[PDB]
Amino acid sequence: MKFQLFIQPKLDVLQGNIVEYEILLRDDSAVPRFPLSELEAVLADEELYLAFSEWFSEAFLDVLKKYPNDRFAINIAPQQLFYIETLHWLDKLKSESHRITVEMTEDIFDVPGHKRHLNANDKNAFILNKIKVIHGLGYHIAIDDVSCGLNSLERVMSYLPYIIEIKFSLIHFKNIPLEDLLLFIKAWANFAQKNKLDFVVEGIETKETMTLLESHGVSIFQGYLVNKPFPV
């Protein structure tokens, strides 16, 4: 209803090649924005979540068909994993998982009501299990926006068996002096290397910035330029 898909090509900072396309939810707005309140309303009702899920999986499959040679990243909030429908549509798209990355978002949404009786430890176990399942289906799993939301180092550590990628988004950290932010970037870069994970830095304004990040010992990673998403 109030929903549509956008794509953001993810462009390598140094040579500008398209590494993958990320899929983004947007509203039907004058100027489309992420539909935060609408997705939360859907997440709070199993029947609406089922309709949303049917829409999303079909629309996304249409995109996969239209670009059959490329990798697609989709965003899934951990709280989505409390609905079996989420895993059911990942299962139905599983012939394409070799070219799909599931970016687990940093979002803290209200847990669907039929799983609210679980304590905090049992909730984390349930989610980790579902991440196991997604990994088992052969999706690449990435942690999105690390050091944001609930994507703290502890969480990244719990997900670690099942992930291939850590993403750090400069955009989420505007007001931190870069020389201060650089120490967190260096920490995550080293973590990624030690654990044979790909490290991605998103929201890099120019190649100038790359070199900037380059002096202060961030050696191995993929950088993505800032660019506007657009309708699919």
Place this chain on the structure above:
Amino acid sequence: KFQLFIQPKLDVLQGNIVEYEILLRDDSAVPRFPLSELEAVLADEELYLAFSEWFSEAFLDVLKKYPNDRFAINIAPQQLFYIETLHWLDKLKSESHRITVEMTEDIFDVPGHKRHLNANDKNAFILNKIKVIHGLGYHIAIDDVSCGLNSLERVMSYLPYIIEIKFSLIHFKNIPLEDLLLFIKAWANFAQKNKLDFVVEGIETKETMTLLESHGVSIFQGYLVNKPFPV
């Protein structure tokens, strides 16, 4: 079915008591944090009122017993959606000048009457309550940074109102210390740049301190590992 423990916080280098932390425990043969019980209380306003009345009175008894010392209490951000929480912080406010509110990294379910708020409006509502607590003169610490929801983004959002950030080695057993040390150094610098106090908890012994120093963790309060006990 709840009781309070205290954990004296002991300086790693000279062993003095910096402050005492108040910890919730159940009535078990071996007491543990009563996670399920506290979540059930958080899910029901009437039980939360009754728990709040118990807690605040019990904690006030403690304060009277040790009138010269600083006490740290843990508050989960979701407790801020209940007006009762600010009501008892308001009632204890004559002592706020020796109380630290440690905002925990917990992700509990938000009380039902505030679930209608979108994620942005929920964050603003918590931030407003933290402003209030800071306004009452409490010291506010962020507990267990880089755990739970206490990510760098959150710490940034809390920043005007905090004086302390705490990093707990205990939460990160399986990270090789030379890798963990880069995160510790990042937070140590963040604290200095922002004139926050940096605390590293869960230091087993004095050698660790040298390590921390050799890797740019210059100014911090180290705390030893020790057992809490009934108040």
